[PDB]
Amino acid sequence: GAPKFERKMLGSYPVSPEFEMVWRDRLTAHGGYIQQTISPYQLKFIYPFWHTFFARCWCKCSAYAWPWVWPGLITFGLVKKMNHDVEEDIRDHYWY
Amino acid sequence: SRAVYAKLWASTAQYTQRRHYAWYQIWSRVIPWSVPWGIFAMWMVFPAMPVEYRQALTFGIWQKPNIGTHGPDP
């Protein structure tokens, strides 16, 4: 949950059992904020996914390139070198 | 005075050593519980050992049961 100095409540009404986990993670909104949300019944909800497709795909694929792909190519190459030495070792021992 | 303040600061310099002295005190109170648990363990595995070994740990006291069956063949 949250730290003790954040869990402190301003009100006095008792915490209801269905809300025990909500108030175990209370966090103070330091400085305040203003929130605006639209009803899902009044939004386009598939077009936004494709409108931002190229930007999202660039971000994900760029992050994964070095750390995942570069070790994978090396592992693939080692798999081929291994299989090339096995064949040659079978003929140097059993073939005439 | 600075001399007084120095001695008060140093009073708690050996924290690590005092925690080690705590280890000794507690482990000395706990370690005797190994005897009850040890007796029960040997008590449980005694019948799974060979007859020759069962007579050694008891100084010849223990012997096979005599219930009146499986006697010598004439």
Add this chain to the structure above:
Amino acid sequence: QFHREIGKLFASYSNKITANSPVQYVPSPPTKGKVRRALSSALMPVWFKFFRGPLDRWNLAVMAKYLRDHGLMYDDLYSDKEPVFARALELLPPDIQAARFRRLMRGTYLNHLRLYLPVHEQNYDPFIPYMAPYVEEAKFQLQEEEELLGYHMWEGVWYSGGVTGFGDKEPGEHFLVALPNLYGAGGSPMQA
């Protein structure tokens, strides 16, 4: 009296430490040995130029680009689940606490969309240590408490008062003290 003899050994080693303790600051001794500090200096011009040097420089570039993409500072990466850092956050003044709150909100939103910030919003140094004065004061407060109160393994009543009895103070945080009530509507420890 076997306990009094062991206590004599502890006491002898204790008095020796005290008699050899300086009364002013003295630099700590070198850790690595002379044999290890000689090989490093001999291989340094080659090891540093081609390996260790570029490793250090790649590391800082990787960190800086990730933080700037999300609008974050390095110190924003520490958690309030650390006792030291939690105490430090309690000591902050309003203006610094508000800016951290806002950066953390914005960075969660950007990571959700997976969209970079524009380059002109990334023109800042993310490695400014804005938490340092409060971290060093927190360490001092908690080191005092531990030395003055936590120098022994204290006994206690077991499974009484909502706690286990082995040192916990906040109730219901271990499985063997889970489920405090069968009937009723329960309650909050923060409303006692």
Add this chain to the structure above:
Amino acid sequence: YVGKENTKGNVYEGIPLDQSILEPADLRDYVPPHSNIQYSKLDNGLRIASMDRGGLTASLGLFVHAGTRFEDVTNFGVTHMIQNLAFASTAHLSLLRTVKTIEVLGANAGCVVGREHLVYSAECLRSHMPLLVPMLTGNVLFPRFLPWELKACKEKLIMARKRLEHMPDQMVSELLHTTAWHNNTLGHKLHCTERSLGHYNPDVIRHYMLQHFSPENMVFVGVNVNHDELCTWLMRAFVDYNAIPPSKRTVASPVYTGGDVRLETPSPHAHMAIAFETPGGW
């Protein structure tokens, strides 16, 4: 106590208290001590006075001429705040280590606020005097007044007058002062009010101490101590650091007005008090 060197245990085991265990080397011919008061002064102006009666428990006290009669409409409650922050963190010792070390020594200490004087005091075995002197003088030499420590003391600051309401004798006395010297000098209240919380910040406190807590306005007293040894350790507490500098202050004369005040409260008795002024005081 990391182990123990001595291993002889209770060497008086089995010996009842109707029998003495002393040896001839423990006997002396009594020599009375110096029971008259001796006087000394430091170069910064601190006055010192002590007397020895031969006891084993000493009493130590630091008196400051800075009571509630010196407050004004922008300061009401400041002397009570300083009393509740006594033995808090100083430049060379934290709050926790100060109060925990006094307890482990077996001593008792406190701070009491009044209308003309503030007093810090402690009592302890007479061999611990050098250890207790700095923990008394530090409150007036270099207190820090940390924000988070002021915020932890704000609770006990209001519970004083609340606890005063259910103490009839103390309430009649306060009402007598507030009514005798209307809005001046000896008529100011001792404790804070909810209004006082509007100026409970370090700058107001530190400004009050700079006007009243100079060494010339302080006296130190001990009982069951060696005079020369007390002077040496008091000199060592002030030699390396700078004290609040002196200041000239004019003391306003009290203005007696008299009057009448009532306070209804659930009680089976009717408390009544009538008084007059004594010209000149002490």
Add this chain to the structure above:
Amino acid sequence: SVHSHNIRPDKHELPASEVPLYYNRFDQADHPSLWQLEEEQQRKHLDQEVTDVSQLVEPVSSPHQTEGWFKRLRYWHYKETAEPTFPRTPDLSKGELAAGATVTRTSVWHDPNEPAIVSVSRFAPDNFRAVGFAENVPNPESTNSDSHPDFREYRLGPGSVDRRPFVYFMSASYFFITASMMRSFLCKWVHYWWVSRDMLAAGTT
């Protein structure tokens, strides 16, 4: 609570304002403080000495009351039957009780020679007490009877031997018997787990 009351109309169990079951004779005090005088001027049966069951006081209640097929118990007091809009008016001259609906929905409390505010002040439940109250209802002084023993008869006082060694040898003996029982049950479970007599023989050749 999880229990509901059963206040409803009933055609066979008539309302108490018409069939009370309990003996319907009550005295009435102008102010309930007067009952303290009744308690000091009336005699109590429990202060007389009787020796035989045949001399015990006879109840004023009649045994003939509840009737019906397969009704085993034959005497009751109270019921939850609903009271109607216009209940029967109690007859105070015969000692009948006036309480609840029979005060609020009847004119039983009117008195020609008194203000209404004064008359109705005497019809709170603390103003009525059943005949026989002062003579009968017990008020015990202890849970213990002087005809029965208590700890004074059984206490081990000065000159007595210490019991601690015996109490703990009693408990220790129970435990070394119960420990042996457990060890035997576990050893038998392990044997059952091990090879059987038919397979041990097949291995020998």
Add this chain to the structure above:
Amino acid sequence: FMSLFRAHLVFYRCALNLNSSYNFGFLVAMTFVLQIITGITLAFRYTSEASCAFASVQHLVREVAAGWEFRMLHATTASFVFLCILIHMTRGLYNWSYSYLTTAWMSGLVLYLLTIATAFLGYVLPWGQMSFWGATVITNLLSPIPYLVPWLLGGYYVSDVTLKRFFVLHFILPFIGCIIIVLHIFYLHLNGSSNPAGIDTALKVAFYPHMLMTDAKCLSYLIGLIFLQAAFGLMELSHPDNSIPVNRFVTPLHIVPEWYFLAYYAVLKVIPSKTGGLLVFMSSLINLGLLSEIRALNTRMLIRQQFMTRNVVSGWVIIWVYSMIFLIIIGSAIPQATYILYGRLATILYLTTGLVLCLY
């Protein structure tokens, strides 16, 4: 218990930047449910008697209505249990989740060992050649421990008595696992879950409906892929020799266990010593458990973000993953000197990566 249901599955608040990497705990749970349902159903017609076990499985498929569906679903879903667990564990090592979710990590490790033992017991039940000879071998690697083998079997060899008791244990252990899942969740919701960025944040929303619909979407894919594989047989998840009756005096030409046990079976195969190979087994588990105390192993204060994004030095978990894949290939190969050489190369990486995770 409905206030607990709404507190933990309706109003529980979660960080907005969660994604599919945080959905595989639910999928594992659902695989247990499916196994319990299909398992109990198979038990109504299975025979533990060794002389008739193999035949009871075939008769179940060939004669009983829908018998093929419950048999093939139980076999396929078992493979998906281990794939989900592997992805589940790898997320934790990528995000250093064990830093503050300590008892959640330890409880999870116990669940993993319980699932390993359950799967091993179930694979012996059909009583084919691979059932018998795989149990004989895997139960000999435990020979260094004295008398830990002849009792679990109750005989001088994997006889008909071992089969009866493996059935009862296999029946019971999954329900014990369900008990430990409750502890697992207790230790998680004590602290709250982490997020992909590794930061604290107040931008959280309720589980229902936003996050509940992501779990539901993933469930659809799982059910569709299980049925696809079960009803058409696209991949080869089972070995053909287990379609042959047991023969105690004829060893098959190639003995290899299921794919989810192959990698560590290869490690133990390239180490010649039998006692040294079992010590290697303990050290690996000990390393995983020690990660629960990673905060204390160095005085520098750690961070959850590990900075693998765009980093050419990669991360230790990624290097481990490829070493595991490399060993699955070695384990599936015929013994040959060249295979043994490279297998030892990969074993060093497999073990060293675990140890260095405790360094920072």
Add this chain to the structure above:
Amino acid sequence: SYGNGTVLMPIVRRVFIGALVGIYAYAATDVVL
């Protein structure tokens, strides 16, 4: 530290470390030394 009841994990930490030091020391003496 003072104030919490996490009292078993510090024991598990010291047992695991010790076990590792013994496994890799028993293998070196058999292969190297």
